[PDB]
Amino acid sequence: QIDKNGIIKSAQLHDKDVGSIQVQVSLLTSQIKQLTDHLLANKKDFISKRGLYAKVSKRKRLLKYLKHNDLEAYRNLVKTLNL
Amino acid sequence: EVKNDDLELALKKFKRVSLEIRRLAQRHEYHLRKGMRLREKRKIAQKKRRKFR
Amino acid sequence: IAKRVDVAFITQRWLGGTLTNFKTLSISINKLNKLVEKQAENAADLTKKENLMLSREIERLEKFFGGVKSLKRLPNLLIVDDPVYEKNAVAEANILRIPVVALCNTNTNPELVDFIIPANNHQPQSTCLLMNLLADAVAEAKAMPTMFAYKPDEEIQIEI
Amino acid sequence: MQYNIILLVDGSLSLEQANQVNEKQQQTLTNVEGLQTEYLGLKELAYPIKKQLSAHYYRWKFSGDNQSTKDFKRTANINKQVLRELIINLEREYGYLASINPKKQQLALQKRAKYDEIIARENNPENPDVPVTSGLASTQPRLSRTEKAQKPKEELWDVVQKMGNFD
Amino acid sequence: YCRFCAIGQLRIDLIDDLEALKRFLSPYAKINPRRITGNCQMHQRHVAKALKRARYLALVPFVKD
Amino acid sequence: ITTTKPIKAHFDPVADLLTKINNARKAKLMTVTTIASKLKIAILEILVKEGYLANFQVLENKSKTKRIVTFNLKYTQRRIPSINGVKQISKPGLRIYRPFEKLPLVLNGLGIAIISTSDGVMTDKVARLKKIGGEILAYVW
RNA sequence: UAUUAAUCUAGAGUGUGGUAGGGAGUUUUGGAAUUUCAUGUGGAGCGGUGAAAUGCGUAGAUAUAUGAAGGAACACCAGUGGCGAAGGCGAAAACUUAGGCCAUUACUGACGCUUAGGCUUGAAAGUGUGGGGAGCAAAUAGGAUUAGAUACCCUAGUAGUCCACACCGUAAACGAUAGAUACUAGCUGUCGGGGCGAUCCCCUCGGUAGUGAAGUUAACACAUUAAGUAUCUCGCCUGG
């Protein structure tokens, strides 16, 4: 399982936040890692590949938007390596 | 039916049983397309619905 | 109501064409006059077939052209019980310029009626009361007595 | 998830040896705890699975690791003593947290009123009564107020009409 | 009239509900249609799955009545 | 004043208001509402001061978090809306700006076009009086 | 409107709780039926056609009783059903995973649409590597048919139909309707979520169908899921 609660505890920015940028990107990275494991397990899960591409597209667009509208937005990338 | 205690009504219902068996085997005495098979199934369902209001 | 007040009436609904032109109404009234004043002298002289044909023609004229025998110009008004089931005449009246007054509950097109009467005709008593009210409304014009206009009573009659 | 493990012994056998093999085969479970020992007695199978028409059924109830069963799966299939290893988990369509369960009074009322104990009473199982009294999933109200209004007008009647005294 | 609609249980287990399933069994040991059962879409498929699992457990004979 | 079933801004002021107007005059609807903005406020102002529109209101609940406008249409007892036709010339994909002597007129002067140059929207005759051209946005008549 | 500066959240997702499915793949398990074989009886037919024939039979077949092997499809439920972006998806279960719906009283701050180039998936037939190959069967042979029949009919028999790996990327891959954005009379069924509650009906948000006014299209026809209303983007169209 993804164990989202640890991801919530990882990079909180508020006293109560589940929809901030950091939580979204951390959950995206966790899901990317899990899906990479599952696709290297079985190499014919096409729907899983489509979901993987959707997740990576979401992550890329959010990261680019943060880097455009803010400067220190990608400060969570040193503590959580990209890709 | 399976049991038989009436005079001839048991064979009368066995006629229905044989008709059901024949109509089920109707799908297994000649081969056709799977899509055409499901289309025929839908048409049979529509005919049954017309028979059942 | 027709036998009470001297006005034309329709027994069976129009088949179309009996209201858009006067020439057909003229030949109809001429046929009625000829038929009545000729059958006044022909009831048993020849075979039963021709006399029965004369009677059948009289009855057919009653069925369709029964009430249209006292008009020289096109009807200036008409009262309809419902635009549905009588669509032909109301459509002609839309084509024509004659004003329309009619009964309609909700199953109508309000555009086709110029004097809306949202009176339900499902219950017979209301229809009877409104028909008598309109008969009394047209009664005062020809100086004939009125019965149910201000009377403190409702017409109650079990359905026949 | 839950674990309803229905287990079959090798046909019609004794009870002592049945408990012996049950508790021996239960040792294969890795670390999951919370099980209840149970037996469903001597039942009659619908068709001969191998040669027998009667055997003992067993029902398991516990919850734990999802990887603590494939070992039991591979041990049960090979051996001839255990025949069927049906598994039910919380993937079977279900749902209840604290309030979807206590509705059995509906069937209680059905059983009570539906049956006729008086020769002059008939309550059909499919009858309408219009019982909706209060509670309607309120229409999500949202209030406001005007601050800059202009040109107020009122129209009451709009349908086709025409003048009178048709001459 | 459906028994699974008159209770609103929305869940059925294999044990202690077999009598209703056998009541819904034609003398040919086949799943009865939706003409009489009263099951609409969810009770119907749950009953079907339960009967299939019982068949796999030799609780209802397949074709041999 | 209360309106549930929350509304959504279509894409932009002019297109939304124009399609609402066209659908209302097709369906003979009295009241039509939409999302509030300065441009739509100006459009409603000019179209109500030009004698083509009934009452118009702008409202909010407690802040600009939910701020909308609503308007009625001028009518007649014979069930005929005052407006008859509309066509948008300016589009989100194309905006044309024209000088003074290139100022269009609708019908032949009967219709009113809406032109904003530097002081909100205005009528064609006033813009020609001030000899300021600018951009048109829609023809109504 | 183009830039920047900030703000707010009717967009957007996120989370919370409820939530539904033939969604997908990997791994195990079952029965029904067919064929072959072995054993029990069996003695002149069997099989097939509109009519017949080809074909099979005393080495004892079809008919059956029991059992085994074996691989192909997973009736019943199964339906104006459901699911997914499409192709397509229906035995049972184990593991992982996909997206959807509802109240949001929660969060961030417009982060949204479309998408040239690229990338991924993409029936069925076939190509290559290797197994397995019960039936089904193009080409192939025979017998009937026809004036002729290289066809429809029947009996034979490989490729193939199955699977593991890497290919093909074709179609009526159809709703012959690109997506999105809001808005515009109604009515009748079905299902999913919420509340009330013996069922049933009720309301609210939705998937999904049918009927049907404005309006549209040349007509047919379409009708809140538009071929209406207008907008944004991409692609496509110029006689045969």
From Swiss-Prot, chain A:
GO molecular function: rRNA binding; structural constituent of ribosome
Keyword hit for rRNA-binding: yes
GO CC annotation, single: cytosolic small ribosomal subunit
Record keywords, A-Z: Ribonucleoprotein, Ribosomal protein, RNA-binding, rRNA-binding
CDD domains the UniProt entry points to: Ribosomal_S15p_S13e
GO process annotations (BP): translation
Presence of the UniProt keyword Ribosomal protein in the record: yes
SUPFAM superfamilies the UniProt entry points to: S15/NS1 RNA-binding domain
Superkingdom of this protein's organism: Bacteria
NCBIfam families the record matches: S15_bact (TIGR00952)
Subunit structure as annotated in this protein's UniProt entry: Part of the 30S ribosomal subunit. Forms a bridge to the 50S subunit in the 70S ribosome, contacting the 23S rRNA.
Function: One of the primary rRNA binding proteins, it binds directly to 16S rRNA where it helps nucleate assembly of the platform of the 30S subunit by binding and bridging several RNA helices of the 16S rRNA.
Name of the protein in its database record: Small ribosomal subunit protein uS15
Name of the coding gene: rpsO
Swiss-Prot record, chain C:
Keywords: Ribonucleoprotein, Ribosomal protein
Gene Ontology terms describing biological process: translation
Taxonomic source organism: Mycoplasma pneumoniae (strain ATCC 29342 / M129 / Subtype 1)
GO molecular function list: structural constituent of ribosome
Keyword Lipid biosynthesis: no
Family named by the database record: Belongs to the universal ribosomal protein uS2 family.
Name of the molecule in the record: Small ribosomal subunit protein uS2
Keyword Ribosomal protein included in the entry's annotation: yes
Parts of the chain that traverse the membrane: none
Gene Ontology, cellular component aspect: cytosolic small ribosomal subunit
Shown part of the complete sequence: 99 to 258 of 294
From Swiss-Prot, chain E:
Superkingdom, taxonomy of origin: Bacteria
CC annotations in GO: cytosolic small ribosomal subunit
Gene label: rpsR
UniProt keyword annotations, A-Z: Ribonucleoprotein, Ribosomal protein, RNA-binding, rRNA-binding
Shown part of the complete sequence: 40 to 104 of 104
Protein name per its UniProtKB record: Small ribosomal subunit protein bS18
Description of how the protein assembles with itself and partners: Part of the 30S ribosomal subunit. Forms a tight heterodimer with protein bS6.
The protein's role, per its UniProt record: Binds as a heterodimer with protein bS6 to the central domain of the 16S rRNA, where it helps stabilize the platform of the 30S subunit.
Sequence similarity: Belongs to the bacterial ribosomal protein bS18 family.
Keyword Ribosomal protein assigned: yes
Any one GO molecular-function label of the UniProt entry: structural constituent of ribosome
Gene Ontology biological-process entries: translation
UniProtKB/Swiss-Prot annotation, chain F:
One of the record's GO cellular component terms: ribonucleoprotein complex
Organism taxonomic ancestry: Bacteria, Bacillati, Mycoplasmatota, Mycoplasmoidales, Mycoplasmoidaceae
InterPro entries: Ribosomal_uS8, Ribosomal_uS8_CS, Ribosomal_uS8_sf
One MF term in the entry's GO annotations: structural constituent of ribosome
Organism: Mycoplasma pneumoniae (strain ATCC 29342 / M129 / Subtype 1) (Mycoplasmoides pneumoniae)
Function in brief: One of the primary rRNA binding proteins, it binds directly to 16S rRNA central domain where it helps coordinate assembly of the platform of the 30S subunit.
Record has Ribonucleoprotein as a keyword: yes
GO annotation, biological process: translation
Quaternary structure, from the entry: Part of the 30S ribosomal subunit. Contacts proteins S5 and S12.
Keyword Membrane among UniProt keywords: no
Family label: Belongs to the universal ribosomal protein uS8 family.
This protein's UniProt keywords: Ribonucleoprotein, Ribosomal protein, RNA-binding, rRNA-binding
Top-rank lineage group of the source organism: Bacteria
Coiled coil ranges: none
Protein name per the record: Small ribosomal subunit protein uS8
